[PDB]
Amino acid sequence: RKQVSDGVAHIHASFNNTIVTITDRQGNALGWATAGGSGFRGSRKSTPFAAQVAAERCADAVKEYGIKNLEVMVKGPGPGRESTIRALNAAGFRITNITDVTPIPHNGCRPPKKRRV
Amino acid sequence: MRHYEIVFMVHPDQSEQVPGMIERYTAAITGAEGKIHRLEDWGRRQLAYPINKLHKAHYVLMNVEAPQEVIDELETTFRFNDAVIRSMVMRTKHAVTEAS
Amino acid sequence: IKVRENEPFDVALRRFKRSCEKAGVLAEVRRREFYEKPTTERKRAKASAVK
Amino acid sequence: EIDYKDIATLKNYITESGKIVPSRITGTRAKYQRQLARAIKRARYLSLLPYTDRH
Amino acid sequence: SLSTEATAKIVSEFGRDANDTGSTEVQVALLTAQINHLQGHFAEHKKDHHSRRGLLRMVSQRRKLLDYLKRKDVARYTQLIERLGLRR
RNA sequence: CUUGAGUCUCGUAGAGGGGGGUAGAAUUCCAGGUGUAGCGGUGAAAUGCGUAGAGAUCUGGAGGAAUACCGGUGGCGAAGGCGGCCCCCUGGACGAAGACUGACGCUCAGGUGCGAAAGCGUGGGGAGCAAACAGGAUUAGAUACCCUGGUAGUCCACGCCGUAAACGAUGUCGACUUGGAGGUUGUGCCCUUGAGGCGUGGCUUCCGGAGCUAACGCGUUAAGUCGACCGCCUGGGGAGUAC
Ligand SMILES: [Mg+2]
Ligand SMILES: [Mg+2]
Ligand SMILES: [Mg+2]
Ligand SMILES: [Mg+2]
Ligand SMILES: [Mg+2]
Numbered sequence A: 001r002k003q004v005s006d007g008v009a010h011i012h013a014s015f016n017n018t019i020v021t022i023t024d025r026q027g028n029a030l031g032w033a034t035a036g037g038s039g040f041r042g043s044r045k046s047t048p049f050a051a052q053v054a055a056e057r058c059a060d061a062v063k064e065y066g067i068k069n070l071e072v073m074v075k076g077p078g079p080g081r082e083s084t085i086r087a088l089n090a091a092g093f094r095i096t097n098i099t100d101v102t103p104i105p106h107n108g109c110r111p112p113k114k115r116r117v
Numbered sequence B: 001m002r003h004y005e006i007v008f009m010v011h012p013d014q015s016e017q018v019p020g021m022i023e024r025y026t027a028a029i030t031g032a033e034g035k036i037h038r039l040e041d042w043g044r045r046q047l048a049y050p051i052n053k054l055h056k057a058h059y060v061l062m063n064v065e066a067p068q069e070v071i072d073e074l075e076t077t078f079r080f081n082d083a084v085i086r087s088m089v090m091r092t093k094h095a096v097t098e099a100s
Numbered sequence C: 001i002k003v004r005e006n007e008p009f010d011v012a013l014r015r016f017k018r019s020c021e022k023a024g025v026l027a028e029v030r031r032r033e034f035y036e037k038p039t040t041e042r043k044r045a046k047a048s049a050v051k
Numbered sequence D: 001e002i003d004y005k006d007i008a009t010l011k012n013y014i015t016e017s018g019k020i021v022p023s024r025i026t027g028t029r030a031k032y033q034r035q036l037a038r039a040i041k042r043a044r045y046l047s048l049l050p051y052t053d054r055h
Numbered sequence E: 001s002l003s004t005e006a007t008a009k010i011v012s013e014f015g016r017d018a019n020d021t022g023s024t025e026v027q028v029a030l031l032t033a034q035i036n037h038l039q040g041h042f043a044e045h046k047k048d049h050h051s052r053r054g055l056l057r058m059v060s061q062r063r064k065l066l067d068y069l070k071r072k073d074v075a076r077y078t079q080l081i082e083r084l085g086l087r088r
Numbered sequence F: 001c002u003u004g005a006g007u008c009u010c011g012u013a014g015a016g017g018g019g020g021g022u023a024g025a026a027u028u029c030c031a032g033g034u035g036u037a038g039c040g041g042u043g044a045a046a047u048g049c050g051u052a053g054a055g056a057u058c059u060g061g062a063g064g065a066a067u068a069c070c071g072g073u074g075g076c077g078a079a080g081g082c083g084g085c086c087c088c089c090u091g092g093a094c095g096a097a098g099a100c101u102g103a104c105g106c107u108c109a110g111g112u113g114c115g116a117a118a119g120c121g122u123g124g125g126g127a128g129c130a131a132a133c134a135g136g137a138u139u140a141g142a143u144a145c146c147c148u149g150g151u152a153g154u155c156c157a158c159g160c161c162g163u164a165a166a167c168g169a170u171g172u173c174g175a176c177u178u179g180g181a182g183g184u185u186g187u188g189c190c191c192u193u194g195a196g197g198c199g200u201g202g203c204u205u206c207c208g209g210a211g212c213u214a215a216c217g218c219g220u221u222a223a224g225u226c227g228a229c230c231g232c233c234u235g236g237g238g239a240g241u242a243c
Helices: A048-065 A083-090 B012-031 B068-077 C014-019 C026-030 C038-042 D007-013 D030-045 E004-012 E024-043 E049-072 E074-084
Strands: A006-012 A019-024 A029-034 A069-075 A094-100 B006-010 B084-089
Touching (some): A019 A048, B084 D030, E024 E049
Parallel strands (some): A006 A069
Antiparallel strands (some): A019 A029, B006 B084
16 A cells, blocks of 8 residues: 555553554544454443454454554543554554553543432 | 843854854843843753754853843744744842853 | 663563652542642641651 | 753753753752843743753 | 931931931831831832831831920920921 | 840841842644544543544743742731742841940720721723533432533732631740750851860750649740730520511
8 A cells, every 4th residue: 555664553542442543644634443443332331351352353454555554643641542552563463652541631621420329 | 220130042054053043142131221141151961851852952051130120021032033932031139150 | 751771571560650740649540639638638648647 | 040041051950841940950059040040031932942851 | 118318317317416326206207208108108009008117117106206306305306396297 | 224126337147028020841722744543531431522634742932820959847017918039118126246315114994006807889801710501420319529611719910808727726025944856047266187075145946843733734935933914705495696
């Protein structure tokens, strides 16, 4: 297709779901995969295993781009926050950098109340 | 008069102005019975973050001792001079010299 | 929280995030806020920190 | 620790995340800890130091 | 507070002599200074209540000073008011 | 007269107050790129947003609000309360040597002023959050808690409202009465060789003796021992209600 051989790997470790997107060092998403979309829903979709099957499932798409090495961009808590990385590398990927782009405001917007039981 | 440790950094592709700016300010201050106690031209320099774009800035020092008026008249020029970007001006604390 | 670590070696060195951002702060701002709850519930940690 | 231009002395009171290092994990006196913080704050605005390690 | 210059200056213009900062008259003077100078600052802002507290204190304090002077020497009191145009 | 109170000189610390600038992190919104079938949410769900291409991802821009870290057993203020950085205007407190006034003091019904949040008026502003309201879910029901949205308001200027578990549930000023450990800020002195050691003022935590207390507990920052002035209580309900 383009044969990038080296891009980045964004990981959305949301408290409920986990999606992994692979894109060149530019930003242009090459391919993506999501936990909830990889089968199990609700309860099971928000587990560490969930993200794993997703990560590998993503590579089965971007690997066709001749991707060899790639960095790792992670943000957010919840499971699959770290898991995704392992499966990503173990799946045969020359990893290099890993940074937590988790958004942390120096006190700005007021978070929502919610949860009260 | 009240001392003011001013440190203004100008746009990189404007470095040629740095000399002009300085010579003017200094004179303007002295003209009003000012009294410069320091001066440093750190010139170009890497930037921690791309403030107002670019990753390089031309820094300059001052640390004068003139009446609030003139220095205040200057606090505005730095704003109406596309060339100069971020600016700051601390207070007296007794004229400092050398080092930095 | 950067982690490049030259030379190949399957070690995450994740401990870094666990010493600043990530949870603690993230989990903190997750749900609602406090407004007054900290000056107390949080300032009550000393009543314990004493010993 | 008292001056802001001294980006060298301040880099000691800053974790590899931009945030300033607590006073309890440096012994540094309270009186000094406050003065030191200010130097780091105004220094960050002069782009002489990073707000965080990300940007 | 007040400028050292104006301070020392007004110290003699009313002080029983020189470097005798403390005379009932001296005080009143030093008080009326900031008392009148502050108005200029208070005319503006207005919502600076916390700073008003100080203003009011010196105000009342002055009254308590004059009231005293008049009790210990009706002379200086009547003469002091003039140089300051106080008492209405 | 000088020890009470105040004045002057020189410093010290401070999220004290008023005004004006300004920086970075994030959210949301708009536009475009990459990319494709989900995303969002929960205990599950569902409403909802997605092929009219969301979500994720990158770039550019707009805008409002709040200032991670430092930060604390912390600091400042009369109380309410006050946290990014910079400038201007300004109030208080403390120490130090001393110099000066010479009881100018303490308290204070009435009075005057300050007063969290919510609320009200005028004109602005409006990102996020959210009374009301509308859906979805839960339940026997669910006019709720939970989820998806969302107006007032929250922000600003000026004016009004004067209340709160406005609390230390403990009025202000002053003098006395064994201790211990700690925080914070000033200061005299000593090879500080180095931090340090001998102290000496201000503010402030925790423990505790005597004594006080119905007990719990308070305990040199007293609720102990005393003095000056003030406010207030006199069974529960009715009722901080009616007139
Ligand atoms: Mg709601
Ligand atoms: Mg209000
Ligand atoms: Mg209104
Ligand atoms: Mg206090
Ligand atoms: Mg006790």
